Nucleic acid binder design. Structure first.
Lengths: 198, 455, 101, 125, 99, 103, 51, 121, 153
RNA sequence: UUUUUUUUUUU
RNA sequence: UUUUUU
RNA sequence: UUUU
RNA sequence: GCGAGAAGGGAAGUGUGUUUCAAAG
RNA sequence: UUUUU
RNA sequence: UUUUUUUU
């Protein structure tokens, strides 16, 4: 009835989804795992070393570009590596006997099993910067919270139609730091709604 | 400059936050009503009049709420449309006046004693016809091939020079191309490689320029963003390196990456700046050969120029000991350092029996009202939800607060930060009103506890 | 044609495109065809044809610039690329590739 | 105002082609807005009564539900910021009576003026 | 910069004492005099800045008042024309029926 | 008494505007003009109901004062309040007369 | 500039270049050889040791 | 006064934070320094995209500071066009030019930006 | 321009003043700085809220949130404050630092004592310098070959 | 449930 | 106290 | 108190 | 000399209160 | 309460 | 490869 060969149509939205009797059918799905753990442990040591050696030449952003790592992911590698080494050199406790919540214990098992089947990743595979793309991220993505409407209705006419009312930013209160001392911390309360600045 | 008083620094943050929220207006054009309207005469007359009201609605900012009586407001709402520029949209004259005195109303200079002379980022015209109109080696960023389809800074340069300059360009590339083929054949990718340089004497392009280099640049659409950044760094480093043992030290690289190959003022900017510093110091060199001691950047675009300046600031940080910032919470800890001796017997209570740990008490609230009036209301003294502000950054050596720091952290409910019909708040003149005479007078009333919580 | 390709693959300034349809890209066409030399300038090519010499005027690129009957964007025997720069290689898409995987 | 509420009974018919309606000044203006949206095929003033045609598609009519909000005995008014809450996530048609003539609910929010909800077309709960 | 600067601290110490007064009183009175000068500075600054805002708001009121006056005048005139045109037709028509 | 959320609804705001006049002025028709320099003005007010969302009307008869005694029975006039008490019944002052009944 | 597109198999990911870092070239070489295997890679084994 | 947490089988899984962000303005915005900043899709995650980071970066840079009717229209248009054209001496595409006439068109190209920046020849 | 502050002044209560309040939950009381009259109760009517004060916080450092655009405005109106209030505002730079108890001239022994503490801190620095050259996580002693760990903070 | 942080949408 | 196990 |  | 009902439910229905404005002893 | 089997 | 699966 209509021609639209693209991948952002109503029917093409959320491809490979159960629409019918297949919703109740059990299906296995891949297990997610953070990128900072899938990398080769060997490379983590190397990356940490560089960071700790010369932060100027080896910045947080430049270091992650060569190995293809995000600015946030590379930060955790140094932080997690530091603590592991600190307890070994100082002869405090072994990493295996370290106390940690159950959420991390299950994560460690997955990391070991991930490599035992496929293997560790020699180089990360992720983009440093994001990209505006059409994807389904939760139920709050395909909804307009400003006008609170799902279906947009407009008049059909060839002539220029009047534009819609643009929204205004929401003014909220914030706090800033002016003077900081060991025995006292002074702060300032900002009120954007005040006409007189002074 | 160098605001030492606490009051001056406190007011600086207020202006920065207000500037971000301020947005210039954008009046949209309105179409003319149609004369051959098929509607009935009664509706046609009303529609024609309504069109004029909308035009003035978006071009007539409203005054303060306190100006007119309450009654007046109610009648206007039901008689005229709502203006698009409310009193609580833009800042008043007070904010503009303050910036004049504070000093917020040649851009950057990175100077290193011993290695590099200066690094000026002055932005102005190159071929308009000293800081930025005297050098001896001009740069160019042409397309991979020797023919510019459209756009590009080099398109203008080549045409300006006329056939005299063009003839020299085609001869130099021809010889270089042939040399690569023979060298790669006798000893044992038929095109050019990104990172090559070519020399071309000036032919009247600019009286104040001696040489004119030709450095090829790659594209941006190839690969992802992570791969694109890696490619640009390789070309920059190779270009700079070759230039060193070429001639006198005077670089006039206007702006690399701009044109038609894809550019990013945010990301690309940092690459360039960061690269310049290394060249000067010659980090990647076993045998130091100081030849190049002058690097400058020239940009025509005002917008771009401003952005470039920002990059400079970041570059200066973490490199020079005189501009090394440090958070206050960790700065004081680092000063009062001590050596603590811990024996084996002091860690007896540190160890625990259970291996794993988790929450042993669900956070499920039992009484919603009883708990709220016992542990929520007493601990809440503000009508707005404000999170903990970021820490203050201080210097390492001098131990004084710096000028540039992190911005504010505004909070929004449910993520949405857009209001279509903002109301007229009464917070514009706290404890102040208008008298019959027109003068400003105060009031004596208890403030509403939920004033800011009822937008 | 440009509008149709834009919807099929979003690509412009500051975005990673697949390079499909651009003049400087190799595609697996059913039959041989000449490159798209329409976007090249006419002033620089004409002045460069004489200085290039006979080596790069009749044996480098023109020796195979008219071997095929078909062409792209019409025909232009005067404007061409004397230099032998191969515009090979391509890029993978980010939408269709993620669906089959 | 009473004659305005008498149009829903005549226009809400399945097995019919054209229905009469009392002539009124306000009623004429209402039909103009509905025709723009494509709900009424056409109408004609036959003197003391107005003949209005009915639109059908695959048997069923285009109009399936009519709700009268305003009544002669009272008056419903909503502020510009309150109409959005009422009307949200719907395809319905609300007739708004503003000072500058009569317009739909979509245009009322654009101008930001306080209208008056008269009737509802193709509205659920 | 003087009152809030380091010079204020040393100024209090360099003060002449008086018989019958404690050492702390000499500094307290000196500090009180300084506190009187800061009040005037803030008062003058607030008034100067408030004047700029008051003038800006006055211009908006005048512009809005003029715009509203024209809109009402034009709208009222159009309505009167329709009534006058119709009233004339009835008067002449009524006399015709009487004959 | 009205709640905080009841002062922002269109129903209450519209009723308020009708009742509200410059200088707290009122509109009413005279019903008694027997005593010298005295006229009883009957004013009509309005109120809003937040339960059924309906507005009713209730008459408010008040006494007024006239200097020239121009007003007569059955003539709509305008009244203005005053910050005092004059006479046993007199509580208002005349400004003008809108409509005049023949004799 | 487009015409009838003929299906053709390409490997843009495994494409050595003159600007890639030495580590990237090494990493891609091993990965490429694993996918091209048709004896071990395209097989399913239940037990870990060759029992 | 609440601490949400899972109370079911799926007690340990990736729970990414989502921050819905609708369109900032429905009006058509131009390209900043040639880089398009128009909205492509409505689905936006918490992480700020590079395209949006450019617009917000430039926002903070902008400082707060700074007879018949038909006959009259044509009369003013001619006077304005002539006056503006004479200031340079004492838009649409497709403007061809010859190689030997480059100097003649070069001055015209650079002169239109002083009186009509909207021209994009 | 004294006419603009007439409403503020109250005949029954008194002139305006700046003080603190005591509110919250038992055991975790926090101070709240507000503006009120002289005879007004400690917890009651208030004109405007200037900020708050938390002398006890989890981090161990006393916090202080105040409005820089309101405190200066109120002082011009002629609002007094207690001795303790002046000291806190002095550190923030809003008002001149008031003298401490007994004045400044009497502070003779404290000056010498402060110098000794400062000298000790500088000398301690010199001690740790040598440590970094031969840092040893594990150091024994000639008593029983006992292990003694070393860690900085 | 963060070694050197009093910062952290930790999960 | 046993069984299993990169 | 597996920080009084 | 200055401060002190800081422990008050006894009066009132169209009142006590709320809201809109005004106040150079 | 007690505590490196 | 750690008193790992394994549980006052």
């Amino acid at each position: 009835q209509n021609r639209f060969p693209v991948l952002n149509t109503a029917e093409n939205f959320r491809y490979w989804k159960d629409r019918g009797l297949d919703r109740l059918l059990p299906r296995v799905f891949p297990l997610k795992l953070p990128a900072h753990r899938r990398v080769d442990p060997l490379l983590r040591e190397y990356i940490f070393f560089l960071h700790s050696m010369d932060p100027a030449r080896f910045s947080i952003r430049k270091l992650g570009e060569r190995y293809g790592l995000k600015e946030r992911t590379v930060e955790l590698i140094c932080r997690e590596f530091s603590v592991a080494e600190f307890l070994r050199r100082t002869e405090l406790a072994t990493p295996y006997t370290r106390r940690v919540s159950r959420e991390k214990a299950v994560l460690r098992m997955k990391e070991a099993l991930f490599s035992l089947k496929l293997g560790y990743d020699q180089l990360g595979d992720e983009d440093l910067d994001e990209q505006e793309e059409h994807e389904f991220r939760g139920f709050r993505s395909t909804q307009d919270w400003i006008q609170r409407q799902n279906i947009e209705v407009e008049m059909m006419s060839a002539f220029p139609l009047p534009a819609k009312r643009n929204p205004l930013p929401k003014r909220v209160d914030v706090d800033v730091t002016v003077h900081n001392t060991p025995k006292l911390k002074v702060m300032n309360w900002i009120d954007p709604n005040d006409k007189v600045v002074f | 400059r160098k605001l030492r008083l606490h009051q001056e620094r406190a007011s600086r943050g207020h202006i920065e936050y207000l500037r971000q929220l301020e947005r210039p207006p954008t009046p949209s054009p309105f179409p003319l009503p149609p004369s051959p309207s098929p509607s009935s005469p009664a509706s046609a007359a009303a529609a024609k009049a309504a069109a004029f009201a909308e035009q003035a609605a978006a071009q007539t900012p409203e005054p303060s709420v306190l100006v007119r009586s309450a009654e007046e407001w109610i009648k206007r709402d039901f008689f005229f449309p709502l203006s698009h520029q409310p009193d609580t949209a833009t800042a008043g004259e007070a904010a503009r006046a303050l910036e004049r005195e504070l000093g917020l109303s040649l851009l950057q200079q990175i100077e290193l004693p011993g290695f590099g002379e200066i690094n000026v980022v002055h932005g102005d015209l190159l071929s308009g016809s000293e800081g930025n109109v005297l050098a001896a080696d001009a740069m160019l960023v042409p397309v991979p091939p020797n023919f510019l389809p459209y756009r590009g800074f080099g398109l203008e340069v080549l045409e300006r020079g006329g056939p005299a300059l063009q003839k020299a360009a085609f001869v130099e590339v021809k010889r270089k191309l042939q040399q690569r083929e023979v060298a790669r054949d006798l000893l044992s990718e038929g095109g050019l490689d990104p990172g090559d340089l070519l020399l071309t004497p000036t032919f009247g392009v600019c009286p104040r320029v001696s040489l004119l280099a030709f450095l090829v640049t790659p594209y941006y659409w190839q690969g992802n963003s992570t791969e694109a950044a890696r490619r640009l760094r390789f070309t920059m480093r190779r270009a700079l390196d070759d230039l060193n043992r070429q001639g006198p030290g005077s670089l006039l690289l206007p702006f690399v990456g701009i044109g038609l190959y894809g550019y990013e003022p945010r990301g690309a900017a940092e690459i360039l700046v960061e690269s310049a510093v290394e060249q000067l110091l010659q980090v990647d060199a076993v045998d130091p050969n100081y030849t190049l001691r002058k690097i400058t950047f020239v940009d025509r675009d005002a917008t771009n120029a401003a952005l470039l300046a920002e990059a400079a600031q970041a570059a200066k940080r973490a490199w020079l000991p005189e501009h090394q910032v440090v958070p206050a919470p960790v700065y004081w800890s680092q000063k009062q350092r001590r050596l603590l001796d811990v024996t084996d017997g002091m860690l007896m209570f540190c160890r625990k029996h259970t291996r794993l740990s988790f929450k042993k008490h669900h956070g499920v609230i039992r009484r919603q009202k009883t708990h709220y009036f016992s542990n929520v209301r007493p601990f809440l003294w503000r009508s707005s939800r404000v999170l903990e502000p970021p820490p203050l950054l201080l210097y390492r050596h001098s131990g004084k607060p710096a000028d540039w720091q992190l911005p504010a952290r505004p909070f929004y409910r449910q993520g949405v930060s857009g209001l279509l019909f903002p109301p007229r708040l009464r917070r514009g003149f706290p404890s102040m009103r208008v008298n019959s005479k027109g003068q400003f007078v105060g009031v004596n009333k208890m403030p509403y506890i939920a004033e800011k919580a009822q937008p | 044609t440009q509008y149709i390709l834009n919807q099929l693959d979003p690509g412009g300034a500051g975005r990673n495109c697949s390079g499909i349809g651009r003049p400087d890209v190799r595609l697996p066409l059913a039959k041989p065809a000449a490159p798209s030399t329409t976007h090249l300038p006419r002033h620089l090519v004409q002045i460069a044809r004489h200085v290039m010499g006979e080596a790069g005027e009749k044996v480098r690129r023109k020796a195979l610039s008219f071997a095929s009957t078909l062409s792209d964007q019409g025909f232009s025997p005067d404007v061409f690329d004397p230099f032998g720069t191969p515009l090979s290689e391509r890029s993978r898409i980010k939408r269709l590739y993620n669906l089959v995987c | 105002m009473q004659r305005a509420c008498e149009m829903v009974v005549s226009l809400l018919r399945v097995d019919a082609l054209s229905q009469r309606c009392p002539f009124h000044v306000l009623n004429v203006q209402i039909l103009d807005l509905l025709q723009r949206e494509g709900l009424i095929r056409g109408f004609k003033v036959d003197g003391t009564k107005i003949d209005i045609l009915l639109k059908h598609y695959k048997g069923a009519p285009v109009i399936r539900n009519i709700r009268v909000v305003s009544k002669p005995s009272r008056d419903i008014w909503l502020t510009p910021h309150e109409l959005k809450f009422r009307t949200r996530f719907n395809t319905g048609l609300w007739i708004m009576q503003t000072s500058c003539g009569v317009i739909s609910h979509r245009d009322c929010l654009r101008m930001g003026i306080g209208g008056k909800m008269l009737m509802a077309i193709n509205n659920g709960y | 910069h003087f009152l809030l600067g380091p010079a204020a601290i040393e100024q209090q110490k360099a003060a002449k004492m008086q018989r019958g007064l404690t050492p702390y009183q000499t500094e307290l009175f000196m500090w009180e005099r300084q506190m009187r000068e800061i009040r005037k500075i803030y008062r003058a600054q607030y008034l100067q800045r408030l004047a700029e805002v008051t003038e800006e708001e006055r211009q908006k009121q005048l512009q809005l008042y003029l715009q509203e006056k024209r809109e009402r005048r034009l709208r009222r005139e159009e309505q009167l024309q329709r009534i006058y045109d119709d009233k004339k037709r009835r008067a002449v028509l009524k006399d015709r029926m009487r004959i | 008494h009205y709640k905080t959320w009841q002062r922002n609804t269109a129903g209450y705001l519209r009723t308020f505007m009708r009742n509200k006049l410059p200088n707290n002025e009122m509109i009413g028709y005279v019903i008694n003009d027997k005593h010298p320099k005295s006229i009883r003005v009957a004013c009509d007010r309005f109120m809003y109901v937040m339960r059924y969302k309906k507005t009713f009307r209730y008459t408010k008869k008040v006494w007024a004062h006239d200097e020239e005694s121009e007003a007569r029975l059955g003539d709509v006039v305008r009244i203005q309040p005053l910050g005092y008490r004059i006479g046993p019944w007199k509580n208002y002052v005349l400004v003008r007369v809108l409509h005049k009944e023949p004799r | 500039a487009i015409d009838e597109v003929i299906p053709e198999e390409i490997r843009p990911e495994f494409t050595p270049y003159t600007w890639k870092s030495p580590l990237q070239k090494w990493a891609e070489e091993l990965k490429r050889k694993r996918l091209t295997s048709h004896n071990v890679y395209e097989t399913e084994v239940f037990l870990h040791p060759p029992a | 006064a609440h601490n949400p947490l899972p109370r079911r089988y799926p007690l340990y899984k990736h729970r990414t934070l989502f921050l819905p962000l609708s369109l900032p303005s429905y009006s058509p915005q131009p390209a900043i320094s040639g880089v398009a900043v128009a909205p492509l899709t409505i689905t936006t995650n918490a992480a700020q995209l590079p395209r949006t980071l450019l617009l917000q970066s430039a926002v903070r840079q902008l400082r707060p500071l700074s007879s018949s009717w038909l006959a009259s229209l044509a009369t003013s248009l001619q006077d304005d066009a002539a006056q503006l054209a004479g200031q340079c001496f004492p838009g649409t595409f497709l403007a061809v030019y010859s190689s030997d006439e480059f100097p003649a068109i070069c001055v015209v190209r650079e002169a239109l930006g002083r009186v009509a920046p909207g021209v994009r020849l | 321009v004294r006419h603009m502050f007439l409403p503020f002044y109250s005949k029954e209560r008194g002139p305006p003043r700046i003080r603190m309040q005591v509110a919250g939950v038992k055991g975790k009381r926090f101070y709240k700085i507000v503006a009120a009259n002289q005879r007004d109760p400690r917890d009651g009517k208030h004109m405007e809220v200037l900020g708050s004060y938390a002398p006890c916080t989890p981090s161990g450092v006393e916090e202080l949130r105040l409005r820089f655009s309101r405190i200066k405005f109120w002082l011009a109106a002629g609002a007094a404050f207690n001795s303790k209030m002046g000291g806190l505002l002095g550190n923030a730079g809003l008002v001149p630092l008031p003298p401490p108890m007994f004045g400044w001239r009497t502070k003779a022994r404290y000056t010498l004592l402060e110098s000794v503490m400062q000298k000790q801190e500088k000398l301690r620095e010199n001690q740790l310098r040598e440590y970094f050259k031969t840092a040893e996580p594990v150091v024994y002693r000639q008593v029983s070959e006992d292990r003694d760990d070393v860690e900085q903070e």
